[PDB]
Design a protein around this nucleic acid. Structure first.
Lengths: 23, 512
DNA sequence: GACTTGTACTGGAACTCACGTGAACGAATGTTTTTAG
Protein backbone atom coordinates (compact mmCIF):
# COMPACT_ATOMS: atom_id res chain seq x y z
CA UNK A 1 0.00 0.00 0.00
CA UNK A 2 1.34 3.47 -0.87
CA UNK A 3 2.44 5.64 2.02
CA UNK A 4 3.02 2.74 4.42
CA UNK A 5 5.74 2.93 7.06
CA UNK A 6 8.49 0.32 6.75
CA UNK A 7 9.33 0.35 10.46
CA UNK A 8 5.71 -0.22 11.57
CA UNK A 9 3.66 -2.11 8.96
CA UNK A 10 -0.05 -1.35 8.98
CA UNK A 11 0.43 2.31 9.95
CA UNK A 12 0.81 5.05 7.34
CA UNK A 13 4.12 6.88 7.56
CA UNK A 14 3.88 10.26 9.29
CA UNK A 15 5.46 13.23 7.54
CA UNK A 16 8.15 14.97 9.63
CA UNK A 17 6.90 18.03 11.49
CA UNK A 18 8.13 21.18 9.75
CA UNK A 19 6.72 23.69 12.21
CA UNK A 20 5.86 27.10 10.78
CA UNK A 21 6.90 28.05 7.24
CA UNK A 22 5.74 31.51 6.17
CA UNK A 23 4.50 31.75 2.59
CA UNK B 1 -22.08 38.81 48.43
CA UNK B 2 -24.44 37.85 51.24
CA UNK B 3 -28.18 38.49 51.38
CA UNK B 4 -30.72 38.81 54.19
CA UNK B 5 -34.18 37.40 53.49
CA UNK B 6 -37.09 37.93 55.90
CA UNK B 7 -39.73 35.39 54.85
CA UNK B 8 -43.08 36.65 56.17
CA UNK B 9 -46.00 34.23 56.00
CA UNK B 10 -49.73 34.11 56.74
CA UNK B 11 -51.17 31.56 59.17
CA UNK B 12 -54.70 32.94 59.25
CA UNK B 13 -57.95 31.00 59.21
CA UNK B 14 -58.92 32.30 55.77
CA UNK B 15 -56.25 30.07 54.21
CA UNK B 16 -57.49 26.81 55.73
CA UNK B 17 -61.08 27.33 54.51
CA UNK B 18 -60.95 26.62 50.78
CA UNK B 19 -62.06 24.09 48.19
CA UNK B 20 -60.16 20.80 48.76
CA UNK B 21 -59.38 20.48 45.05
CA UNK B 22 -57.89 23.98 44.91
CA UNK B 23 -55.09 22.88 47.29
CA UNK B 24 -55.74 25.70 49.76
CA UNK B 25 -52.93 28.27 49.80
CA UNK B 26 -51.53 27.17 53.17
CA UNK B 27 -50.14 23.92 51.78
CA UNK B 28 -48.78 25.55 48.61
CA UNK B 29 -47.07 28.32 50.59
CA UNK B 30 -45.61 25.69 52.92
CA UNK B 31 -44.26 23.74 49.95
CA UNK B 32 -42.73 26.88 48.43
CA UNK B 33 -41.12 27.75 51.77
CA UNK B 34 -39.69 24.25 52.09
CA UNK B 35 -38.35 24.19 48.53
CA UNK B 36 -36.65 27.56 48.95
CA UNK B 37 -35.11 26.37 52.22
CA UNK B 38 -33.68 23.23 50.60
CA UNK B 39 -32.31 25.25 47.68
CA UNK B 40 -30.57 27.63 50.09
CA UNK B 41 -29.30 24.82 52.33
CA UNK B 42 -27.74 22.74 49.54
CA UNK B 43 -26.34 25.86 47.83
CA UNK B 44 -23.86 27.28 50.36
CA UNK B 45 -23.99 30.92 49.28
CA UNK B 46 -23.66 32.28 52.84
CA UNK B 47 -27.16 33.75 52.94
CA UNK B 48 -29.16 34.62 56.06
CA UNK B 49 -32.89 33.90 56.30
CA UNK B 50 -35.39 34.65 59.07
CA UNK B 51 -39.03 33.63 59.46
CA UNK B 52 -41.99 35.77 60.53
CA UNK B 53 -45.65 34.74 60.81
CA UNK B 54 -48.81 36.81 61.15
CA UNK B 55 -52.32 35.73 62.07
CA UNK B 56 -51.17 33.37 64.84
CA UNK B 57 -52.62 33.18 68.34
CA UNK B 58 -49.40 34.11 70.13
CA UNK B 59 -47.54 37.41 70.10
CA UNK B 60 -43.75 37.82 70.15
CA UNK B 61 -42.40 40.95 68.44
CA UNK B 62 -39.82 43.59 69.40
CA UNK B 63 -42.63 46.17 69.25
CA UNK B 64 -45.97 45.60 70.99
CA UNK B 65 -47.62 48.94 71.71
CA UNK B 66 -51.38 48.65 72.04
CA UNK B 67 -53.89 46.67 70.00
CA UNK B 68 -51.64 47.18 66.97
CA UNK B 69 -48.75 44.82 66.22
CA UNK B 70 -50.62 41.82 67.62
CA UNK B 71 -50.99 38.20 66.50
CA UNK B 72 -47.49 38.37 64.96
CA UNK B 73 -44.46 36.23 65.77
CA UNK B 74 -40.78 36.14 64.78
CA UNK B 75 -40.08 32.42 64.72
CA UNK B 76 -36.51 32.57 63.37
CA UNK B 77 -33.87 35.29 63.52
CA UNK B 78 -31.10 36.21 61.07
CA UNK B 79 -29.01 33.04 60.91
CA UNK B 80 -27.75 30.53 58.37
CA UNK B 81 -30.29 27.98 57.11
CA UNK B 82 -30.16 24.50 58.62
CA UNK B 83 -32.14 21.27 58.69
CA UNK B 84 -33.64 22.35 62.03
CA UNK B 85 -35.53 25.05 60.13
CA UNK B 86 -36.86 22.43 57.71
CA UNK B 87 -38.01 20.24 60.61
CA UNK B 88 -39.69 23.23 62.27
CA UNK B 89 -41.45 24.14 59.02
CA UNK B 90 -42.66 20.59 58.44
CA UNK B 91 -44.48 20.11 61.76
CA UNK B 92 -43.86 22.92 64.27
CA UNK B 93 -45.93 25.34 62.13
CA UNK B 94 -49.70 24.83 62.12
CA UNK B 95 -52.62 27.01 61.00
CA UNK B 96 -54.14 29.40 63.52
CA UNK B 97 -57.53 31.00 63.98
CA UNK B 98 -56.85 34.77 64.22
CA UNK B 99 -56.35 37.57 61.69
CA UNK B 100 -53.72 40.27 61.34
CA UNK B 101 -53.00 43.34 59.23
CA UNK B 102 -50.25 42.56 56.72
CA UNK B 103 -49.13 46.20 56.89
CA UNK B 104 -48.23 45.66 60.55
CA UNK B 105 -46.47 42.45 59.49
CA UNK B 106 -44.46 44.45 56.95
CA UNK B 107 -43.59 46.94 59.69
CA UNK B 108 -42.37 44.08 61.89
CA UNK B 109 -40.35 42.68 58.98
CA UNK B 110 -38.74 46.09 58.48
CA UNK B 111 -37.99 46.30 62.21
CA UNK B 112 -36.33 42.88 62.34
CA UNK B 113 -34.36 43.32 59.10
CA UNK B 114 -33.14 46.71 60.36
CA UNK B 115 -32.29 45.65 63.92
CA UNK B 116 -30.68 42.25 63.25
CA UNK B 117 -28.62 43.46 60.26
CA UNK B 118 -26.16 45.48 62.36
CA UNK B 119 -22.59 44.21 62.43
CA UNK B 120 -22.86 42.32 59.13
CA UNK B 121 -22.45 43.33 55.49
CA UNK B 122 -25.35 42.60 53.14
CA UNK B 123 -25.34 43.64 49.49
CA UNK B 124 -29.03 42.71 49.14
CA UNK B 125 -32.16 42.60 51.28
CA UNK B 126 -35.51 41.01 50.45
CA UNK B 127 -38.93 40.56 52.05
CA UNK B 128 -41.39 37.99 50.67
CA UNK B 129 -45.06 38.19 51.69
CA UNK B 130 -47.20 35.03 51.57
CA UNK B 131 -50.86 36.00 51.95
CA UNK B 132 -54.23 35.55 50.27
CA UNK B 133 -55.30 39.18 50.85
CA UNK B 134 -58.56 38.00 52.45
CA UNK B 135 -58.30 39.88 55.77
CA UNK B 136 -59.91 43.22 56.54
CA UNK B 137 -57.39 46.03 56.99
CA UNK B 138 -57.05 49.82 57.03
CA UNK B 139 -54.64 51.87 54.91
CA UNK B 140 -53.21 54.65 57.08
CA UNK B 141 -49.40 54.19 57.16
CA UNK B 142 -48.43 53.53 53.53
CA UNK B 143 -46.41 56.68 52.84
CA UNK B 144 -44.02 56.12 55.75
CA UNK B 145 -43.59 52.47 54.75
CA UNK B 146 -42.69 53.42 51.18
CA UNK B 147 -40.30 56.10 52.42
CA UNK B 148 -38.56 53.64 54.75
CA UNK B 149 -38.28 51.00 52.03
CA UNK B 150 -36.82 53.55 49.61
CA UNK B 151 -34.32 54.83 52.18
CA UNK B 152 -33.17 51.36 53.25
CA UNK B 153 -33.13 49.97 49.67
CA UNK B 154 -35.05 46.78 50.48
CA UNK B 155 -36.84 44.88 47.72
CA UNK B 156 -40.34 43.45 48.03
CA UNK B 157 -42.15 40.42 46.63
CA UNK B 158 -45.64 38.96 46.86
CA UNK B 159 -46.98 35.43 46.39
CA UNK B 160 -50.75 35.02 46.00
CA UNK B 161 -52.98 32.01 45.24
CA UNK B 162 -54.03 33.57 41.91
CA UNK B 163 -51.91 34.41 38.88
CA UNK B 164 -53.72 37.65 37.99
CA UNK B 165 -51.83 40.66 39.32
CA UNK B 166 -63.72 34.67 40.92
CA UNK B 167 -62.46 36.67 43.90
CA UNK B 168 -64.11 38.63 46.70
CA UNK B 169 -64.18 42.41 47.00
CA UNK B 170 -61.68 42.30 49.88
CA UNK B 171 -59.30 40.34 47.66
CA UNK B 172 -59.71 42.97 44.94
CA UNK B 173 -58.90 45.75 47.42
CA UNK B 174 -55.83 43.80 48.51
CA UNK B 175 -54.81 43.51 44.86
CA UNK B 176 -55.22 47.26 44.35
CA UNK B 177 -53.18 48.15 47.43
CA UNK B 178 -50.37 45.70 46.63
CA UNK B 179 -50.28 46.93 43.03
CA UNK B 180 -50.01 50.53 44.24
CA UNK B 181 -47.22 49.59 46.65
CA UNK B 182 -45.31 47.77 43.90
CA UNK B 183 -45.78 50.64 41.43
CA UNK B 184 -44.56 53.23 43.92
CA UNK B 185 -41.47 51.20 44.86
CA UNK B 186 -40.29 50.43 41.31
CA UNK B 187 -42.97 51.24 38.73
CA UNK B 188 -44.20 49.40 35.65
CA UNK B 189 -41.51 46.71 35.91
CA UNK B 190 -42.72 45.89 39.43
CA UNK B 191 -46.13 44.70 38.23
CA UNK B 192 -44.68 41.38 37.04
CA UNK B 193 -42.93 40.84 40.40
CA UNK B 194 -46.14 39.42 41.93
CA UNK B 195 -45.81 35.66 41.52
CA UNK B 196 -48.24 32.80 42.15
CA UNK B 197 -47.76 29.70 44.26
CA UNK B 198 -48.01 27.25 41.36
CA UNK B 199 -45.68 29.28 39.13
CA UNK B 200 -43.12 29.63 41.93
CA UNK B 201 -43.28 25.88 42.59
CA UNK B 202 -42.66 25.33 38.88
CA UNK B 203 -39.36 27.24 39.20
CA UNK B 204 -38.23 26.06 42.66
CA UNK B 205 -38.45 22.31 41.93
CA UNK B 206 -34.81 22.14 40.73
CA UNK B 207 -31.78 22.46 42.98
CA UNK B 208 -29.50 25.40 42.26
CA UNK B 209 -26.64 24.78 39.86
CA UNK B 210 -23.03 24.47 41.01
CA UNK B 211 -21.57 27.94 40.43
CA UNK B 212 -17.82 28.58 40.52
CA UNK B 213 -16.07 31.90 39.94
CA UNK B 214 -13.14 31.83 37.53
CA UNK B 215 -10.01 33.78 38.46
CA UNK B 216 -8.64 36.11 35.79
CA UNK B 217 -5.36 35.08 34.16
CA UNK B 218 -3.30 38.09 33.02
CA UNK B 219 -0.75 37.82 30.23
CA UNK B 220 0.49 39.49 27.04
CA UNK B 221 -0.48 38.48 23.51
CA UNK B 222 2.77 38.89 21.56
CA UNK B 223 3.23 39.20 17.79
CA UNK B 224 7.00 39.18 17.40
CA UNK B 225 9.43 40.76 19.84
CA UNK B 226 8.03 44.32 19.60
CA UNK B 227 4.20 44.06 19.70
CA UNK B 228 2.49 43.10 22.96
CA UNK B 229 -1.14 43.55 24.06
CA UNK B 230 -2.16 43.12 27.69
CA UNK B 231 -4.91 40.50 27.94
CA UNK B 232 -6.94 38.69 30.59
CA UNK B 233 -8.15 35.11 30.11
CA UNK B 234 -11.05 33.35 31.82
CA UNK B 235 -12.33 29.77 31.69
CA UNK B 236 -15.64 29.77 29.81
CA UNK B 237 -16.67 26.10 29.56
CA UNK B 238 -15.37 23.15 31.57
CA UNK B 239 -16.64 19.91 33.06
CA UNK B 240 -18.18 20.54 36.48
CA UNK B 241 -17.44 18.33 39.49
CA UNK B 242 -18.93 18.10 42.96
CA UNK B 243 -17.30 20.59 45.32
CA UNK B 244 -17.39 18.16 48.25
CA UNK B 245 -16.31 14.51 48.35
CA UNK B 246 -17.45 11.59 50.47
CA UNK B 247 -15.67 11.01 53.78
CA UNK B 248 -14.89 7.51 55.03
CA UNK B 249 -16.11 6.94 58.60
CA UNK B 250 -16.21 3.87 60.81
CA UNK B 251 -19.51 2.00 60.68
CA UNK B 252 -20.17 1.98 64.43
CA UNK B 253 -19.11 5.32 65.94
CA UNK B 254 -19.30 7.27 62.64
CA UNK B 255 -16.14 9.35 63.07
CA UNK B 256 -13.40 10.27 60.61
CA UNK B 257 -10.62 10.34 63.23
CA UNK B 258 -11.07 6.62 64.03
CA UNK B 259 -9.88 5.47 60.57
CA UNK B 260 -6.41 6.00 59.11
CA UNK B 261 -4.90 5.36 55.68
CA UNK B 262 -1.26 4.72 54.82
CA UNK B 263 0.90 2.92 52.28
CA UNK B 264 4.02 0.75 52.53
CA UNK B 265 6.37 -1.06 50.15
CA UNK B 266 7.87 -4.55 49.99
CA UNK B 267 10.15 -6.72 47.85
CA UNK B 268 9.66 -9.94 45.89
CA UNK B 269 11.46 -12.06 48.50
CA UNK B 270 9.43 -14.71 50.30
CA UNK B 271 10.19 -12.98 53.61
CA UNK B 272 8.09 -9.98 52.45
CA UNK B 273 10.55 -7.43 53.80
CA UNK B 274 9.69 -3.73 54.03
CA UNK B 275 11.53 -0.64 52.80
CA UNK B 276 11.22 3.04 53.64
CA UNK B 277 10.02 5.76 51.28
CA UNK B 278 13.38 7.56 51.04
CA UNK B 279 14.97 4.28 49.87
CA UNK B 280 12.81 4.23 46.70
CA UNK B 281 13.71 5.85 43.37
CA UNK B 282 11.56 6.25 40.28
CA UNK B 283 12.51 4.58 37.01
CA UNK B 284 11.13 3.94 33.55
CA UNK B 285 10.88 1.05 31.10
CA UNK B 286 13.07 0.95 27.97
CA UNK B 287 11.98 -2.09 25.99
CA UNK B 288 12.67 -5.26 27.98
CA UNK B 289 14.72 -3.56 30.73
CA UNK B 290 14.34 -0.87 33.39
CA UNK B 291 16.41 2.33 33.27
CA UNK B 292 16.73 4.06 36.67
CA UNK B 293 15.94 7.77 36.54
CA UNK B 294 16.16 9.68 39.82
CA UNK B 295 13.83 12.61 40.41
CA UNK B 296 16.75 15.02 40.85
CA UNK B 297 18.24 13.86 37.55
CA UNK B 298 14.85 14.28 35.88
CA UNK B 299 14.62 17.84 37.17
CA UNK B 300 18.15 18.53 35.94
CA UNK B 301 17.34 17.19 32.45
CA UNK B 302 13.72 18.36 32.44
CA UNK B 303 12.47 20.48 29.55
CA UNK B 304 12.72 24.03 30.91
CA UNK B 305 10.54 26.82 29.54
CA UNK B 306 9.40 30.32 30.50
CA UNK B 307 5.92 30.45 31.96
CA UNK B 308 2.98 32.72 31.24
CA UNK B 309 3.48 32.91 27.48
CA UNK B 310 0.72 33.75 24.98
CA UNK B 311 2.62 34.02 21.69
CA UNK B 312 1.16 34.10 18.18
CA UNK B 313 3.05 31.45 16.21
CA UNK B 314 1.13 32.31 13.06
CA UNK B 315 -2.13 32.97 11.24
CA UNK B 316 -3.99 30.34 9.22
CA UNK B 317 -7.28 30.06 7.38
CA UNK B 318 -10.23 28.90 9.46
CA UNK B 319 -10.98 26.03 7.07
CA UNK B 320 -7.59 24.50 7.93
CA UNK B 321 -8.58 24.02 11.61
CA UNK B 322 -11.26 21.38 12.12
CA UNK B 323 -13.48 21.06 15.18
CA UNK B 324 -12.82 17.31 15.46
CA UNK B 325 -9.15 17.98 16.32
CA UNK B 326 -9.85 20.12 19.40
CA UNK B 327 -8.06 18.94 22.55
CA UNK B 328 -8.04 19.85 26.22
CA UNK B 329 -10.76 20.00 28.85
CA UNK B 330 -11.36 23.77 28.81
CA UNK B 331 -12.15 26.73 26.57
CA UNK B 332 -10.51 30.09 27.26
CA UNK B 333 -12.03 33.52 26.65
CA UNK B 334 -9.49 36.31 26.18
CA UNK B 335 -10.48 39.95 26.72
CA UNK B 336 -8.44 43.13 26.90
CA UNK B 337 -6.84 44.08 30.20
CA UNK B 338 -9.30 45.62 32.65
CA UNK B 339 -9.30 49.43 32.66
CA UNK B 340 -6.99 49.51 29.61
CA UNK B 341 -8.27 51.44 26.60
CA UNK B 342 -5.20 50.94 24.39
CA UNK B 343 -5.28 47.18 24.94
CA UNK B 344 -8.99 47.16 24.13
CA UNK B 345 -8.38 49.04 20.87
CA UNK B 346 -5.53 46.72 19.86
CA UNK B 347 -7.53 43.57 20.63
CA UNK B 348 -10.55 44.94 18.77
CA UNK B 349 -8.36 45.67 15.74
CA UNK B 350 -6.93 42.15 15.79
CA UNK B 351 -10.36 40.55 16.21
CA UNK B 352 -11.86 42.60 13.38
CA UNK B 353 -8.94 41.84 11.07
CA UNK B 354 -9.21 38.11 11.76
CA UNK B 355 -12.98 38.13 11.23
CA UNK B 356 -12.72 40.10 7.98
CA UNK B 357 -9.97 37.86 6.59
CA UNK B 358 -11.54 34.64 7.94
CA UNK B 359 -8.38 33.67 9.81
CA UNK B 360 -7.41 32.19 13.18
CA UNK B 361 -4.22 32.49 15.22
CA UNK B 362 -2.13 29.42 15.98
CA UNK B 363 -0.55 30.29 19.33
CA UNK B 364 1.61 28.82 22.09
CA UNK B 365 0.05 28.83 25.56
CA UNK B 366 1.60 28.02 28.95
CA UNK B 367 -0.24 28.56 32.23
CA UNK B 368 2.90 29.01 34.34
CA UNK B 369 6.51 27.84 34.69
CA UNK B 370 5.59 24.26 35.64
CA UNK B 371 2.80 23.91 33.04
CA UNK B 372 3.44 21.92 29.88
CA UNK B 373 3.35 24.19 26.80
CA UNK B 374 0.46 23.74 24.40
CA UNK B 375 -0.30 24.66 20.79
CA UNK B 376 -3.80 26.04 20.34
CA UNK B 377 -6.11 28.03 18.09
CA UNK B 378 -7.55 31.44 18.96
CA UNK B 379 -10.49 32.60 16.86
CA UNK B 380 -12.61 35.76 17.03
CA UNK B 381 -16.02 35.96 18.67
CA UNK B 382 -17.90 39.20 17.96
CA UNK B 383 -21.19 40.05 19.66
CA UNK B 384 -23.18 43.26 19.95
CA UNK B 385 -22.50 43.51 23.69
CA UNK B 386 -18.91 42.24 23.71
CA UNK B 387 -16.10 40.91 21.52
CA UNK B 388 -13.32 38.56 22.59
CA UNK B 389 -10.98 35.80 21.45
CA UNK B 390 -11.79 32.13 22.06
CA UNK B 391 -8.85 29.77 22.62
CA UNK B 392 -9.05 25.98 22.30
CA UNK B 393 -6.16 23.52 22.41
CA UNK B 394 -4.91 21.68 19.32
CA UNK B 395 -3.31 18.25 18.92
CA UNK B 396 0.36 17.35 18.67
CA UNK B 397 1.84 14.76 16.31
CA UNK B 398 1.68 12.04 18.98
CA UNK B 399 -2.03 12.63 19.65
CA UNK B 400 -3.20 11.71 16.13
CA UNK B 401 -4.43 8.16 15.49
CA UNK B 402 -4.17 6.61 12.01
CA UNK B 403 -7.10 4.20 11.74
CA UNK B 404 -8.38 2.72 8.47
CA UNK B 405 -12.12 2.26 7.94
CA UNK B 406 -13.88 0.66 4.99
CA UNK B 407 -15.91 2.84 2.65
CA UNK B 408 -19.70 2.72 2.96
CA UNK B 409 -20.73 4.29 -0.36
CA UNK B 410 -18.79 1.76 -2.46
CA UNK B 411 -20.18 -1.27 -0.60
CA UNK B 412 -22.43 -3.52 -2.67
CA UNK B 413 -24.11 -5.37 0.22
CA UNK B 414 -24.65 -2.35 2.52
CA UNK B 415 -26.22 -0.05 -0.08
CA UNK B 416 -29.71 1.11 0.98
CA UNK B 417 -32.56 1.08 -1.51
CA UNK B 418 -34.74 4.01 -2.58
CA UNK B 419 -37.57 3.02 -0.23
CA UNK B 420 -35.17 2.82 2.72
CA UNK B 421 -33.80 6.28 1.91
CA UNK B 422 -37.34 7.66 1.71
CA UNK B 423 -38.19 6.12 5.08
CA UNK B 424 -35.07 7.59 6.69
CA UNK B 425 -35.87 10.99 5.16
CA UNK B 426 -39.38 10.83 6.60
CA UNK B 427 -37.98 9.89 10.01
CA UNK B 428 -35.52 12.80 9.96
CA UNK B 429 -38.25 15.23 8.91
CA UNK B 430 -40.62 14.00 11.63
CA UNK B 431 -38.10 14.12 14.49
CA UNK B 432 -36.82 17.65 13.84
CA UNK B 433 -35.86 19.49 17.03
CA UNK B 434 -35.77 22.96 15.41
CA UNK B 435 -38.81 24.83 14.09
CA UNK B 436 -38.85 27.78 11.71
CA UNK B 437 -40.65 30.88 13.01
CA UNK B 438 -43.42 30.67 10.41
CA UNK B 439 -40.67 30.62 7.76
CA UNK B 440 -40.14 34.30 8.57
CA UNK B 441 -37.06 35.18 10.64
CA UNK B 442 -34.99 32.33 12.12
CA UNK B 443 -35.03 28.93 13.84
CA UNK B 444 -36.20 28.07 17.35
CA UNK B 445 -34.74 25.21 19.39
CA UNK B 446 -37.47 23.02 20.88
CA UNK B 447 -35.07 20.99 23.08
CA UNK B 448 -32.16 23.23 24.16
CA UNK B 449 -29.66 21.04 26.01
CA UNK B 450 -27.59 23.96 27.36
CA UNK B 451 -30.30 24.99 29.86
CA UNK B 452 -30.77 21.54 31.43
CA UNK B 453 -29.11 21.21 34.86
CA UNK B 454 -26.89 18.17 35.29
CA UNK B 455 -29.12 15.37 36.67
CA UNK B 456 -26.20 13.96 38.67
CA UNK B 457 -26.10 16.80 41.21
CA UNK B 458 -29.91 16.87 41.37
CA UNK B 459 -29.97 13.17 42.25
CA UNK B 460 -27.16 13.56 44.79
CA UNK B 461 -28.88 16.44 46.58
CA UNK B 462 -32.25 14.67 46.50
CA UNK B 463 -30.79 11.55 48.10
CA UNK B 464 -28.86 13.57 50.70
CA UNK B 465 -32.00 15.49 51.68
CA UNK B 466 -34.08 12.30 51.85
CA UNK B 467 -31.48 10.66 54.09
CA UNK B 468 -31.26 13.74 56.32
CA UNK B 469 -35.03 13.93 56.84
CA UNK B 470 -35.60 10.13 56.88
CA UNK B 471 -32.56 8.37 58.37
CA UNK B 472 -34.25 4.95 58.23
CA UNK B 473 -36.02 4.78 54.87
CA UNK B 474 -34.10 3.73 51.74
CA UNK B 475 -33.26 6.10 48.92
CA UNK B 476 -36.23 7.00 46.70
CA UNK B 477 -36.62 6.61 42.92
CA UNK B 478 -35.50 9.25 40.45
CA UNK B 479 -37.91 12.18 40.35
CA UNK B 480 -40.26 12.36 37.38
CA UNK B 481 -39.33 15.93 36.43
CA UNK B 482 -35.71 14.86 35.92
CA UNK B 483 -36.86 12.29 33.36
CA UNK B 484 -39.17 14.86 31.77
CA UNK B 485 -36.33 17.36 31.35
CA UNK B 486 -34.00 14.61 30.06
CA UNK B 487 -36.49 13.65 27.32
CA UNK B 488 -37.83 15.59 24.31
CA UNK B 489 -41.39 16.92 24.11
CA UNK B 490 -44.11 14.33 23.52
CA UNK B 491 -44.92 15.99 20.18
CA UNK B 492 -41.70 14.62 18.69
CA UNK B 493 -42.58 11.05 19.68
CA UNK B 494 -46.17 11.50 18.51
CA UNK B 495 -44.93 12.62 15.09
CA UNK B 496 -42.25 9.91 14.89
CA UNK B 497 -44.46 6.96 15.89
CA UNK B 498 -45.36 6.03 12.30
CA UNK B 499 -42.00 6.65 10.55
CA UNK B 500 -40.36 4.39 13.13
CA UNK B 501 -42.85 1.64 12.30
CA UNK B 502 -42.10 2.06 8.59
CA UNK B 503 -38.35 1.86 9.27
CA UNK B 504 -38.88 -1.28 11.34
CA UNK B 505 -40.84 -2.81 8.46
CA UNK B 506 -38.25 -1.89 5.82
CA UNK B 507 -35.03 -2.70 7.73
CA UNK B 508 -34.47 -6.41 8.64
CA UNK B 509 -32.49 -6.10 11.87
CA UNK B 510 -31.63 -9.45 13.48
CA UNK B 511 -29.71 -9.96 16.72
CA UNK B 512 -26.85 -12.44 16.36
C1' DG C 1 -8.55 -52.22 32.84
C1' DA C 2 -4.78 -49.35 34.20
C1' DC C 3 -0.99 -46.64 32.94
C1' DT C 4 1.88 -43.69 29.72
C1' DT C 5 2.60 -40.66 25.72
C1' DG C 6 0.94 -37.36 22.44
C1' DT C 7 -2.50 -34.10 20.33
C1' DA C 8 -6.28 -30.83 20.33
C1' DC C 9 -9.58 -27.59 22.39
C1' DT C 10 -10.84 -23.73 25.24
C1' DG C 11 -12.41 -20.72 29.26
C1' DG C 12 -10.30 -17.78 32.11
C1' DA C 13 -6.28 -14.67 33.56
C1' DA C 14 -3.05 -11.31 32.30
C1' DC C 15 -2.15 -7.38 30.08
C1' DT C 16 -3.19 -3.03 28.01
C1' DC C 17 -6.00 0.95 27.31
C1' DA C 18 -9.12 4.46 29.04
C1' DC C 19 -11.79 6.96 32.39
C1' DG C 20 -13.19 8.61 37.09
C1' DT C 21 -12.24 9.63 42.41
C1' DG C 22 -9.63 11.31 45.95
C1' DA C 23 -5.42 13.49 47.76
C1' DA C 24 -1.11 16.34 48.10
C1' DC C 25 1.84 20.09 46.44
C1' DG C 26 3.20 24.01 44.57
C1' DA C 27 1.61 28.15 42.93
C1' DA C 28 -0.95 31.97 42.47
C1' DT C 29 -4.21 35.56 43.32
C1' DG C 30 -7.14 37.82 45.90
C1' DT C 31 -9.34 39.12 50.34
C1' DT C 32 -9.81 39.65 55.55
C1' DT C 33 -7.97 40.35 60.15
C1' DT C 34 -4.38 41.89 63.51
C1' DT C 35 -0.77 44.86 65.10
C1' DA C 36 2.49 49.03 65.00
C1' DG C 37 3.09 53.97 64.76
Amino acid sequence: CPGESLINPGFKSKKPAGGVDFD
Amino acid sequence: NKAAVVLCMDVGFTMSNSIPGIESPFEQAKKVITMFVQRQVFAENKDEIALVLFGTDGTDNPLSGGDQYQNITVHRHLMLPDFDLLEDIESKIQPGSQQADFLDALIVSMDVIQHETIGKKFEKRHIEIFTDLSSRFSKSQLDIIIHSLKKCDISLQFFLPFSLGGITEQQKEGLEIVKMVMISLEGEDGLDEIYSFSESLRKLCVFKKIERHSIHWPCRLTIGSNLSIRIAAYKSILQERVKKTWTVVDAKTLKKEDIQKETVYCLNDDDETEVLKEDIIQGFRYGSDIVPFSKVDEEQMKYKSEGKCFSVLGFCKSSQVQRRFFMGNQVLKVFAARDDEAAAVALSSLIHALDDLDMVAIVRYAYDKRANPQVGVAFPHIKHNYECLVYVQLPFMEDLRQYMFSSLKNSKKYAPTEAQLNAVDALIDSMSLAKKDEKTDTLEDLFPTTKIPNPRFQRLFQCLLHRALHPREPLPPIQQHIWNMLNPPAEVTTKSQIPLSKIKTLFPLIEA
